[PDB]
Design a protein around this ligand. Sequence first.
Ligand SMILES: O=C1Cc2ccc(Br)cc2N1
Length: 129
Amino acid sequence: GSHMNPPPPETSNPNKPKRQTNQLQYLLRVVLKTLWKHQFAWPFQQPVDAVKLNLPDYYKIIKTPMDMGTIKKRLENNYYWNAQECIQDFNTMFTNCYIYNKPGDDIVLMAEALEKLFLQKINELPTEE
Ligand SMILES: O=C1Cc2ccc(Br)cc2N1
């Protein structure tokens, strides 16, 4: 990994309290699963590598980066305390794309397709038991 990309978001921290919830289980088993296999997932499956993409201003603009590879690791190595934290990561990922890129750009259309799917699934986020 290039020194000119930031370190990725935190995925492991023993000091942060962790909990499994049914909602977090749904986020992994249903939401992440659904979005990961989408035809348009690939740009979002890992941190933006601004060096390889020749976007030297990316991390000048995007100060709260997030991606589904990070979210997958956070879900699989349960990082979260609640589903809101994970939903916020997805929302951050989409908003980064919409802030950095022009409306109607391919990457935006791809993000918008994943977000539509995401919204459908989050509307069915089960009641916390
Ligand atoms: O917004 C972003 C993230 C990203 C992922 C993939 C490609 Br190609 C371009 C970009 N720019």
